[PDB]
Amino acid sequence: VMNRLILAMDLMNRDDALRVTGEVREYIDTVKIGYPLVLSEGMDIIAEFRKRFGCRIIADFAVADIPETNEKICRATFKAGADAIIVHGFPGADSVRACLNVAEEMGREVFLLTEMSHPGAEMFIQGAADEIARMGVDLGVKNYVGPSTRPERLSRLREIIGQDSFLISPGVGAQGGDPGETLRFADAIIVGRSIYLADNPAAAAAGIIESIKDL
């Protein structure tokens, strides 16, 4: 990923989202689009972004349903032009497999969300996260998400998935995570508010990249 930095584009207005993404496009090659934008502007926003910016799009849909519904969600998401989809592992192996099957058929990728970055992840997800990661490995998952806010957990995640697997990490900036420390373990960092709420998003992105280059 260009500069190891993925923009989390969670503005809810098409005009604001396009403005900020355009301002920072020189510093990224990958945009994570989630439900805040999609549910406000429609699934057509994915193909609009892919065309206008020539970026890769990861659909962060935190997919967390039964296998049959997961199948339908992934089909709709890839039809809309997404390059990859984020899928929760907590619901279990059959729900993850359903997503992997659709990605295989459609020539796309699944990212497995292991531990989440916010405080409430400590209640239930953290105690299952090592096993969720090991399930991922067993299923042949090659792309994972884990938390910038807990680099010791990110290290343990990396330990389970190996060096060949690709690991991206949210929680940098607003949630308290640090770019450089997170990039000790993750291949790329996800950054939302620290860039898209900044008075100057391009300057915020540039500032992050300057600290990344220094690594």
Ligand X SMILES: O=c1cc(O)n([C@@H]2O[C@H](COP(=O)(O)O)[C@@H](O)[C@H]2O)c(=O)[nH]1
Residues that bind ligand X (CB under 6 A): 8, 10, 34, 60, 62, 65-66, 69, 113, 116-117, 147, 170-171, 173-175, 190-194
CB of 48 to ligand X, least distance (A): 19
* Helices of type H across the chain: 14-24, 35-41, 44-53, 67-79, 93-106, 125-139, 151-161, 179-182, 193-196, 201-213
Q: Binding partner of residue 137 among a copy of itself, ligand X, none, CB under 5 to 8 Å per kind?
A: none
SS3 171: coil
Contact 168, 6 (CB under 8 A): yes
Q: Binding partner of residue 190 among a copy of itself, ligand X, none, CB under 5 to 8 Å per kind?
A: ligand X
Q: Which is nearer to ligand X, 31 or 80 (CB)?
A: 31
SS3 150: coil
CB of 86 to ligand X, least distance (A): 6
Instruction: Give me the residue whose beta carbon is nearest to ligand X.
Output: 192
CA distance 188 to 1: 7
CB of 190 to ligand X, least distance (A): 5
14-24 and 44-53 helices cross at what angle (nearest 10)? 30
Q: Which is nearer to a copy of itself, 131 or 210 (CB)?
A: 131
Residue 8 has φ and ψ, to the nearest 5°, of: -90, 100
CB of 116 to ligand X, least distance (A): 3
Q: Which is nearer to ligand X, 22 or 91 (CB)?
A: 91
CB of 33 to ligand X, least distance (A): 9
Q: Binding partner of residue 136 among a copy of itself, ligand X, none, CB under 5 to 8 Å per kind?
A: none
For residue 73, which of 56, 48, 91, 51 has the smallest C-alpha distance? 91
Q: Which is nearer to a copy of itself, 175 or 178 (CB)?
A: 175
Pairing of strands 188-191, 166-169: parallel
